Amino acid sequence: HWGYGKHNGPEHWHKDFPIAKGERQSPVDIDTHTAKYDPSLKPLSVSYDQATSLRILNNGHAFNVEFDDSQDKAVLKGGPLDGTYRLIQFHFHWGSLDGQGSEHTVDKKKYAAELHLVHWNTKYGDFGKAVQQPDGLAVLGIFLKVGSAKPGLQKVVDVLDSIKTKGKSADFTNFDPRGLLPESLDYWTYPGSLTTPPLLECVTWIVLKEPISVSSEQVLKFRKLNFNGEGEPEELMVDNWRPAQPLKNRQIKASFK
Numbered sequence: 709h710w711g712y713g714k715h716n717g718p719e720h721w722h723k724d725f726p727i728a729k730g731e732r733q734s735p736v737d738i739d740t741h742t743a744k745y746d747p748s749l750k751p752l753s754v755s756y757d758q759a760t761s762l763r764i765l766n767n768g769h770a771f772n773v774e775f776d777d778s779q780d781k782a783v784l785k786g787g788p789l790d791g792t793y794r795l796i797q798f799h800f801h802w803g804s805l806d807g808q809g810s811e812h813t814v815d816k817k818k819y820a821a822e823l824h825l826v827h828w829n830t831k832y833g834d835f836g837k838a839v840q841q842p843d844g845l846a847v848l849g850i851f852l853k854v855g856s857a858k859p860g861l862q863k864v865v866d867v868l869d870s871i872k873t874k875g876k877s878a879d880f881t882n883f884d885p886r887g888l889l890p891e892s893l894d895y896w897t898y899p900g901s902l903t904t905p906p907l908l909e910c911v912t913w914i915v916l917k918e919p920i921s922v923s924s925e926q927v928l929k930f931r932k933l934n935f936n937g938e939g940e941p942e943e944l945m946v947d948n949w950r951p952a953q954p955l956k957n958r959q960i961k962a963s964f965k
């Protein structure tokens with residue numbers, strides 16, 4: 709099955725998931741000089757005051773922080789979106805070294821990691837029906853750079869030793885995702901896809917311009933997770949990022965001058 713190694717990595721995925729070579733794949737490089745300011749975009753509205761986290765899960769590819777999405781509690785709207793998108797989970801992509809790890813790049817620059825806050829369009833009723841639609845998802849992508857610690861990240865780092873291997877989960881209640889947000893909500897936006905199989909083309913990407921800073925110690929703890937399950941040879945969970953894909957017939961729009 710798919711993964712991030714030599715024999716099952718991103719260059720292989722197209723054989724089980726042919727949409728890997730589709731017309732709106734993600735991530736992409738954001739060429740800041742070519743991204744046009746769109747004064748018709750709206751400020752993004754991120755309303756996370758009532759977010760209910762439930763659990764954290766090592767799925768063998770990354771970890772997911774999962775939310776109760778059975779009511780309008782943590783929603784994204786505004787920006788490029790029509791209507792209301794409900795937070796279902798967040799996860800990260802990261803490198804073995806600080807110079808790589810993000811999926812989107814900015815003028816070919818890679819950040820150490822990238823956070824994805826995944827939301828589904830409530831007009832489709834649930835996540836499974838939303839990923840069958842071209843406007844079913846909105847993913848808020850936030851870059852991580854190594855520097856000062858992010859205090860709001862520490863509760864996630866401190867639980868990782870409890871979900872070291874594939875299939876492990878832990879209670880993860882009362883986590884507030886507002887502590888993962890940078891000051892500015894200035895963003896780039898373009899139509900794309902999930903960056904992991906099944907690579908579905910459902911995503912309005914909203915990529916914040918401002919990275920958050922995390923400490924070297926925090927990212928080191930991500931790199932101690934394992935892709936393997938308990939009792940299997942150890943394979944560290946690092947470099948779980950897909951490289952940039954062809955932009956094709958798409959334009960990236962900027963919310964800011």
Ligand SMILES: Cc1cc(C)n(O)c(=S)c1
Binds near residue numbers: 824826847902
């Ligand atoms: C819904 C979803 C799930 C995963 C694992 N990833 O990586 C993205 S970008 C989106």
Ligand SMILES: [Zn+2]
Binds near residue numbers: 799801824903904
């Ligand atoms: Zn992702």
